[PDB]
Design a protein around this nucleic acid. Structure first.
Lengths: 386, 227, 64, 136
RNA sequence: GCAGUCAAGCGUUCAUAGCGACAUUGCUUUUUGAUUCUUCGAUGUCGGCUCUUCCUAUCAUACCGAAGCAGAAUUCGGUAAGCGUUGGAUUGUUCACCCACUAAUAGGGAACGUGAGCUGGGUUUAGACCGUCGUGAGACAGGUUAGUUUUACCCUACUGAUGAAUGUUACCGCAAUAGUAAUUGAACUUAGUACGAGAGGAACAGUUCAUUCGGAUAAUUGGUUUUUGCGGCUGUCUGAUCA
């Protein structure tokens, strides 16, 4: 026969399979193209997602009707204790694809990073890197042996880094580890730059700047085993149906007599690896500061943490990237912010933003007040108070 | 001394611009071949102020004024308001007005010495309109329509009305204004006169599709072709 | 950025917070939240709801 | 859009599917309108075309002078009552749905409009702004 | 039902801009038939709803060639199935035809796709009414009304979820193979410019929004409320206040 009325599919065939993402930290499948004339710097940076909030700003976008007027916009705060470099790794191009020939580690590793190697930390003797930290007991001729094998070889150089999980309201204590390629020039200058930063720390403003357009890479919020209607967005069947009205009615023709990968079925929803692109950065925030959440017109000193703190997260005592829009994954997840993979114009990008106001009122209710100095101002003294 | 100008493709020039003996005001969109049409006849003499009123491109629709002052609706932002106070002279006094009826263009028509207002506007503002616009206030309707500012187009020399007007209505209302009134159409027969053209003593602009007989009528009653 | 007052409950209204209501005679009503926007749709009198601004203003609360 | 639409319009929440009946706010003599289609709407299996503030539709007059009845003619939505979102951040809605009756070029069959008019309507249709009293 | 070949001829002249009569040569299994090969120790029969996929014989969109194409417009062909193709009134209706939108509202296959997926309006039992016919029981190129819609827990397939053996154990990776997505429209400008006696009247670039699809996400707005979280109210019971 034929469909009798011809309509689009339900569901994107590019995001299949919808199985569970294989770690809470989402991989970075590709990094920006290498520019050898620029200084040496990292291509991505790790962070934890606090929440969202509200932003007023003047829109200057030539020709639009909303040109030169405030517009409210949603931003997500991703939180940043500075990252710290525990090693570097080289890769040699092979006809079967890139391959890591050697790894080189820092001398002194924190509790947090050594904890990543342990399922059972409390029963452990904590002996990881003990034999390795003794390869500095000489002049280093065994480790400088290996950094000389990277320089000679190694088309590309990636730098093992780790998050500082103890500046974060999270309860975890076990830091996340990761590799970040570096786009500065001269693979000889890459392993130099690394070897000089071992156990030093790197900060937001030395990777991402204002107004840049970056990628957000997280694992999706998991909703669990889910049925076809809310998973794939199908019509709900008429009231009168027998054996359930929330389903897909025809699972295929007689032939081919098999069910096809493209029909809609029920299973895992949420908790997938998803990369969203082109997110403008409204602020790159300072770790120790007051009036993180003030701005040139605002002038009242207040941080970006809402009254009562970000729901389910904490207080934001660290650096933060404050990025326009919404981001995959939910609160308290590890986010990986990547540099763009292509140049842009778009005139929406390349627009410089100046935040006119930031919303510090509470997210745990209907917030009437920005600062507790505002609440006590309006509401007057109470029976406790004075 | 009439002029044909088309804002974007629109033929209604009384919507987008408000023209008085002291100053001019124009919409902020599209091409300045619309904007050059004012200067070329005006020159460097009067100011010309690009603006938005309440974010809307309709400035002469939301604003009522003569050379002595301007009135702006409450929805006008203050980020826009100051811009209008500096670009205009300091002689012109803007005084914002809070009223039930938001668009002040349609509700009021006034030339330097006379104003006509929609009858339902409160007795508070007819006090204020006397102060800001500096005129006399008379509550009338031109041929049983409602909005006077849209359907009766005035200037100190003479003024125009929509074609539907009764002759006893024209001769009635001319003695009020002191200026000769003439019915007619514009924009190839559009009933709405005050939204299709803006005019002052030495300039008149109207939509590109106005017919040549119509244009002469505009030219004659506003004393355009000198003299 | 102008801050207005909710006309029922008196609260200050920050951007993107609440709804606006234009009644048949065009008079505009702003509401901080769904609570005061629901008590307005019930015809409740502001001056008899104990926690509103106009309430305390008649009962002479807290102005002292 | 097409004939009469000046500039573009920013999407607002669709409040009036095919079959809705709105007050007709002009003085042209119709008491109400009946939306039979929406100009420019998209086509998807099972959706109902849906109007919104400032749109141009196809209407008929159920209540009003019999001169105007039994005939499809275009109309414009001046009020919504389904709350939509401006970009200055507010949500707002009117007390009820309403509209005016127009020609394919957008001119107004009536000489006036009563009560408010949304300024997504008043800017997009220059004749509607010329007939308007309160604009929001 | 569809596609070629010769062109007697319509078209201002002009066979091939656009056609074709006479006929001839083929293709088509979405026509209707013919046969009676499989099935009567049963392959659940119409249509719609729902949903996936393939074909091209292209309706829209892309880029082209042509006109008896100035522009505008439309028309015929070329590669092309990547992506779309709708809301309804009447009818069981497939079909059809009307109303309005649309860039367009193309033609089909998959056991006339699809009832352990639905529905049960239609045909098609038993009840009943009418019309014609028959002496009658009863019959119908017929009209009408009422009429039980069973089963998965099995094997595969599909969708998700673990997992022994790879000396033990942890972390960081590579990327073979597989899948893959965006879409279309209008407004401002270019420009009342080009072409044009005029009437009329474009386009590349740039810009602001939008339609259908997709992926997320929940600051705000909305919905939801067993936070039975707080307040209000009814009947009754704990002797009442209180709870």
């Amino acid at each position: 026969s034929h469909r009798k009325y011809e309509a689009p599919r339900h569901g994107h065939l590019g995001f299949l399979p919808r199985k569970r993402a294989a770690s809470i930290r989402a991989r970075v499948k590709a990094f920006p193209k290498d520019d050898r004339s620029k200084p040496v710097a990292l291509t991505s940076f790790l962070g934890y997602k606090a929440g969202m909030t509200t932003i007023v700003r003047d829109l200057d976008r030539p020709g639009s009707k909303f040109h030169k007027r405030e517009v409210v916009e949603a931003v997500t705060v991703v939180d940043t204790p500075p990252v710290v470099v525990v090693g570097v790794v080289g890769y040699v191009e092979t006809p079967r694809g890139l391959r890591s020939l050697t790894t080189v580690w820092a001398e002194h590793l924190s509790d947090e990073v050594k904890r990543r190697f342990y399922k059972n930390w409390y029963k452990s003797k904590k002996k990881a890197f003990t034999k390795y930290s003794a390869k500095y007991a000489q002049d280093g001729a065994g480790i400088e042996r290996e950094l000389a094998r990277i320089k000679k070889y190694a088309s590309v150089v990636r730098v093992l880094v780790h998050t500082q999980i103890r500046k974060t309201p999270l309860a975890q204590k076990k830091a996340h580890l990761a590799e970040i390629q570096l786009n500065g020039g001269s693979i000889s200058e890459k392993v130099d730059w690394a070897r000089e930063h071992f156990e030093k720390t790197v900060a937001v403003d030395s990777v991402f700047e204002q107004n840049e357009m970056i990628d957000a890479i997280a694992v999706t919020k998991g909703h669990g085993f889910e049925g076809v209607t809310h998973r794939w967005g199908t019509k709900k069947l008429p009231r009168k149906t027998h054996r359930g009205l929330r389903k897909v009615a025809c699972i295929g023709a007689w032939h081919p007599a098999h069910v096809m990968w493209s029909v809609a079925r029920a299973g895992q929803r949420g908790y997938h690896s998803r990369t969203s692109i082109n997110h403008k950065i409204y602020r790159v925030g300072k770790g120790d500061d007051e009036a993180n959440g003030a701005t040139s017109f605002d002038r009242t000193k207040k941080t970006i943490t809402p009254m009562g703190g970000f729901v389910h997260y904490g207080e934001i005592k660290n650096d933060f990237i404050m990025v326009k829009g919404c981001i995959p994954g939910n609160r308290k997840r590890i986010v990986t912010l990547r540099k763009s993979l292509y140049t842009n114009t778009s005139r929406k990008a390349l627009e410089e933003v100046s935040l006119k106001w930031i919303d510090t009122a509470s997210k745990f209710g209907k917030g009437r007040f920005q600062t507790p100095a505002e609440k006590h101002a309006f509401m007057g003294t109470l029976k406790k108070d004075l | 001394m009439a002029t044909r100008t088309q804002f974007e493709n629109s033929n209604e020039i009384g919507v987008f611009s408000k023209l008085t003996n002291t100053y001019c005001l124009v919409a902020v969109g599209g091409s300045e071949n619309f904007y050059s049409a004012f200067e070329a006849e005006l020159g460097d003499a009067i100011p010309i102020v690009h603006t938005t009123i309440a974010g809307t491109r309709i400035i002469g629709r939301m604003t009522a004024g003569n050379r002595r002052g301007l009135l702006v609706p409450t929805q006008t932002t203050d980020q826009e308001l100051q811009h209008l106070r500096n670009s205009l002279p300091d002689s012109v006094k803007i005084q914002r007005v809070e009223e039930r009826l938001s668009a002040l263009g349609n509700v009021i028509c006034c030339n330097d010495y006379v104003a006509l207002v929609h009858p339902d506007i409160d007795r508070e503002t007819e006090e204020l309109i006397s102060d800001v616009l500096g005129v006399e206030v008379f509550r009338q309707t031109i041929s049983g329509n409602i909005l006077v500012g849209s359907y009766c187009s005035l200037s100190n020399q003479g003024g125009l009305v929509h074609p539907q007007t009764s002759v006893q209505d024209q001769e009635e209302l001319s003695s009020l204004l002191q200026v000769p009134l003439v019915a007619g159409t514009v924009n190839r027969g559009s009933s709405v006169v005050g939204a299709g053209m803006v005019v002052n003593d030495y300039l008149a602009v109207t939509g590109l599709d106005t017919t040549a007989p119509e244009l002469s009528v505009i030219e004659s009653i506003f004393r355009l072709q000198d003299a | 950025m102008k801050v207005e007052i909710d006309s029922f409950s008196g609260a200050k209204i920050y951007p993107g917070r609440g709804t606006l209501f234009v009644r048949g005679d065009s008079k505009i009503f702003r509401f901080q939240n769904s609570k005061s926007a629901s008590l307005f749709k019930q015809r409740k009198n502001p001056r008899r709801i104990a926690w509103t601004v106009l309430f305390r203003k008649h009962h002479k609360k807290g102005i002292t | 859009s097409g004939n009469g639409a000046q500039g573009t319009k920013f999407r607002i929440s669709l409040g009036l599917p095919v079959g809705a009946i709105m007050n007709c706010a002009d003085n042209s003599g119709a008491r109400n309108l009946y939306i039979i289609a929406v100009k420019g709407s998209g086509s998807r299996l099972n959706r109902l075309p849906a109007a919104s503030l400032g749109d141009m539709v196809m209407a008929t007059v159920k209540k009003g002078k019999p001169e105007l009845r039994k005939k499809v003619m275009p109309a414009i939505v001046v009020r919504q009552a389904k709350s939509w979102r401006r970009r200055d951040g507010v949500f707002l809605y009117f007390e009820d749905n309403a509209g005016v009756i127009a020609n394919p070029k957008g001119e107004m069959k009536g000489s006036a409009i009563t009560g408010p008019v949304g300024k997504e309507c008043a800017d997009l249709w220059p004749r509607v702004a010329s007939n308007s009293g309160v604009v929001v």
